Every structure is written in structure tokens, then in C-alpha cells.
């Protein structure tokens, strides 16, 4: 399946705020849209890069696809299993391997292929028992990027038609993330429909389609080249840094926010 949204709007409802926490009642009382007039049309096998300002509705858009948020107006269409990799990297008690194949059946070629493309080999090779290493919930003594690669691997190992990847590339080990984006998202998953939330411009550059969000609104939908001509101010400033993508995630996101505020 591909995915289409035709003029979709979703309002704050009781619970969504608490769901997201993993005052809301005021937002629910005043009937405020969390997302307004969203359009997108992604074919089978394409990658959509979602970016925007902080708290612009990026995660909320994913929740709509998952059915955790209701589309009060408009048309959404997709079929098949979805696999969701949350910004929060959860880790269950058990080995690394058990965490990647959690609730699903081990297949040798599939496993090794996902391990390798998620750049996990460089990690497990530092441990005496490699992917048989036992973790506690939270996987608390690992780095953020290590937790995020195990969690991404878990999501990518699942056999689904649509992959939702919420901000996996947000940590300090920025060269590894560059390698993960190439080998996992661009190669291994080249023919899987996929939605990547991100604040790196390279990911926009390589995307089939682009969605920029600001304040629950679609600032821009289309291709990288349309961004460049249809949003010359935004693009000029964002392509203007020499290595924007190696800034911390907080800096990248604060530059996007400020830029979106400027050229609204
Ligand atoms: N942890 C939170 N505390 C208070 N409000 C929140 C929180 N998380 C989400 N919200 C609310 O939900 C709305 C949209 O949030 P959402 O998480 O979908 O945006 P986002 O683009 O994913 O944010 P971020 O840039 O931090 O990842 C915000 O306007 C805010 O009202
Ligand atoms: Mg988010």
C-alpha cells in the first residue's frame, strides 16, 4: 500500500494528550485542531520525510495513521500492517536479539540483514556475549543511539507494508546515524513505503516527498526541488549552513522553528 490523506483535520480529544505523554483539557474544551488541512499522497515504496518546528504535530500525524487519533474531517487511506518506531526507545528485559525479534519469529537471513543495516554489529561486538547480552528494561547503561538502533531494528524487522520512523536520528553519534540512514532507510528499505520524521536536510534531499509542519499546519508538501523554488527563503537559509545536519538535534530544531516563524 501507499498512503493518502485528503484534506485531513483532527481535533484534540480527551486522552490524546495523555497518550502523547508517552493543559489538554483546555485544548479539548475550545475545540482546537491538533492538525489542519493535511494533504499527502505517497506511492508504494516511497519515503516521505516529515519535518517542521518543535511541537508542530509530527508525532501526532503518526498517531493519526496508527488510529490513535481520529480524523474529524477528510480522507485517509492505507492498508496493511504498520510498524511504528517511536521517538521513545523502549527496551524489554531479555537479550538484544530477543529485543529485536520481540513477539515475532526468528529468521536467520532476515535478522542478520536487519542487524547489519542498522549498524548494530559495531555495538554488539564490544560485548562478551554480543547479541546474547542481557539488558534490563530501559536498557539504561546503553547510549541513546544504541537504544535507538535496537528499537529501529525491532521496528524494521517487523514485516509490514508501512514503516513509521519517529526521529531515530537525534543523538550525538552523528556519523553512525548517517550510515544508518544510508544502509537501513535508503537501501534495505528502498522498496518499503516509509515515513521518517527528521530534522536533517539530507533526509529531505533524498526523500521522494516532503512535508514541513508548523503549528499543526502544512507549511509545504512536495519534492525537494519544489521546496527550493516554492520556498526560496526557507531553503536558502537551510541549505545555507555548511554542515547543518551535524548540529545537535536541539540546535537543528531550534533553527527550523525560528526559520518557520520568520517565513510563515
Ligand atoms: N509532552 C507534552 N507536554 C505538553 N504538551 C504536549 C506534549 N507533547 C505533545 N503536546 C501537545 O501536542 C501538540 C503537538 O505535539 P506533537 O508531539 O505531535 O508535535 P511534535 O512535532 O512531534 O513535537 P516535537 O518537536 O517535540 O517532537 C503540541 O502543540 C502540544 O500541545
Ligand atoms: Mg515528536
UniProtKB/Swiss-Prot annotation:
Q: What happens when the gene is disrupted?
A: Mice are born at the expected Mendelian rate, but about 80% die within two to five days after birth due to peritonitis. Those that survive fail to thrive, appear runted and weigh about half as much as wild-type littermates. Many of the surviving pups die when they start ingesting solid food, due to intestinal blockage caused by excessive mucus accumulation. None survive for more than about 45 days after birth. Intestinal crypts in the jejunum and ileum are filled with excessive mucus. Excessive accumulation of mucus is also seen in colon.
Signal sequence span is none
In terms of superkingdom, the source organism counts as: Eukaryota
Q: In which tissues is it expressed?
A: Expressed in the epididymis (at protein level). In the initial segment of the epididymis, detected on both the luminal and basolateral sides of the ducts where it is expressed in the duct columnar cells as well as in the interstitial smooth muscle cells. Expressed in sperm in the caput. In the cauda, detected along the luminal border but not continuously and is also expressed on the basolateral surface. Within the caudal lumen, detected on sperm. Isoform 1: Expressed in a variety of epithelial tissues including colon, kidney, lung, small intestine, pancreatic duct and testis.
| Residues that coordinate or bind ATP 1 | 12, 52-59, 87
| Modification comment | N-glycosylated.
What are the residue boundaries of the ABC transporter domain, all occurrences included?
23-240
Quote the subcellular location field of this record.
Apical cell membrane; Early endosome membrane; Cell membrane; Recycling endosome membrane
Q: What is the effect of changing residue 102 to A/L/Q?
A: Mildly impairs protein maturation
Instruction: Give the lipid-moiety residues, type S-palmitoyl cysteine.
Output: 118
Outcome reported for the amino acid change (mutating residue 102 to E/D/G/H/I/K/P/R/Y): Abolishes normal maturation
Please state what the annotation says regarding this protein's domains: Binds and hydrolyzes ATP via the two cytoplasmic ABC transporter nucleotide-binding domains. The two ATP-binding domains interact with each other, forming a head-to-tail dimer. Normal ATPase activity requires interaction between the two domains. The first ABC transporter nucleotide-binding domain has no ATPase activity by itself.
Say what the protein does. Answer: Epithelial ion channel that plays an important role in the regulation of epithelial ion and water transport and fluid homeostasis. Mediates the transport of chloride ions across the cell membrane. Possesses an intrinsic ATPase activity and utilizes ATP to gate its channel; the passive flow of anions through the channel is gated by cycles of ATP binding and hydrolysis by the ATP-binding domains. The ion channel is also permeable to HCO(3)(-); selectivity depends on the extracellular chloride concentration.
Q: How does this protein assemble?
A: Monomer; does not require oligomerization for channel activity. May form oligomers in the membrane. Interacts with SLC26A3, SLC26A6 and NHERF1. Interacts with SHANK2. Interacts with MYO6. Interacts (via C-terminus) with GOPC (via PDZ domain); this promotes CFTR internalization and thereby decreases channel activity. Interacts with SLC4A7 through NHERF1. Found in a complex with MYO5B and RAB11A. Interacts with ANO1. Interacts with SLC26A8. Interacts with AHCYL1; the interaction increases CFTR activity. Interacts with CSE1L.
Q: To which protein family does this belong?
A: Belongs to the ABC transporter superfamily. ABCC family. CFTR transporter (TC 3.A.1.202) subfamily.
Q: What is this protein called?
A: Cystic fibrosis transmembrane conductance regulator
Species per Swiss-Prot/TrEMBL record: Mus musculus
